[PDB]
Symmetry: C2
Subunit: 149 residues, 2 copies
């Protein structure tokens, strides 16, 4: 079905399940069906020139893929496969950086219909990572393949 | 010649950036125009039995900075990554490695252009491999070698 895990529990999962992610201090601000918002703290994630390291920005952009899948898709029937991800670093990322990712229920229905019928469906997430002033510091594009069990 | 002695270059590569240090990334070879790094599988696993995508990205991305440390005046210039594509080929199990190079001539062209114009771009197209030599991921990235601007300018 599409019943997401109880929120508070899902937040701990998102922030702690993967040690690599847990060590970065990544926090989940919102975990809803069709909408996730995460925050990567600047502290501890700085690079060699006073801004967020590219790998931390990548992690922030990558996580919504799995988080949004769990809150929006029927995980008992399908599973996601990430084919590739592209990051564009537009400006120095200073302070805490956030990202929002959306996929409405209608889109999920179309995708799962296709995945169910043909065995797989392709979809993507194009996100904007923003700083405290709302400026876009980086943009990501991730190509996913919805696969049926 | 070498812009930095080996142990110092290795220390900077593995520890200058805390995010990288925490991952346990190790430099196997660091020389002008050539670097080889290794990301341990232990501690970098995702929830499904293979290396987390973020660890793969870090391994694939760092060669840009490592080559900078071994090939250029690392006080006069600094590197930045502009854009990068990472393609996942198969679950990455065990320790994963990557190697990258810049020929002598390209190094000269880059420092000259960065010195005269303030910036110069260089790209890297790399393959990450597991202990059996299987290609687990492939990346393409654009970096910029930049000179420090004069404060107040």
């Amino acid at each position: 079905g599409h019943m997401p895990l109880p929120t508070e529990l899902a937040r701990h999962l998102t922030e702690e399940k993967i040690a690599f992610v847990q060590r970065s201090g990544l926090r989940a601000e919102v975990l809803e069906p069709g909408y996730v918002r995460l925050r990567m703290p600047g502290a501890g994630n700085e690079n060699h020139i006073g801004s967020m390291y590219a790998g931390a920005l990548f992690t922030l952009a990558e996580l919504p893929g799995g988080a949004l899948f769990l809150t929006s898709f029927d995980s008992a029937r399908f599973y996601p496969i990430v084919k590739e991800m592209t990051l564009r670093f537009r400006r120095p990322a200073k302070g805490d950086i956030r990202v929002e990712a959306r996929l409405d229920a209608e889109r999920i229905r179309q995708l799962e219909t296709e995945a169910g019928e043909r065995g797989k469906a392709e979809y993507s997430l194009e996100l904007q990572l923003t700083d405290e002033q709302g400026e876009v510091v980086a943009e990501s594009a991730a190509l996913y393949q919805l696969r049926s069990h």
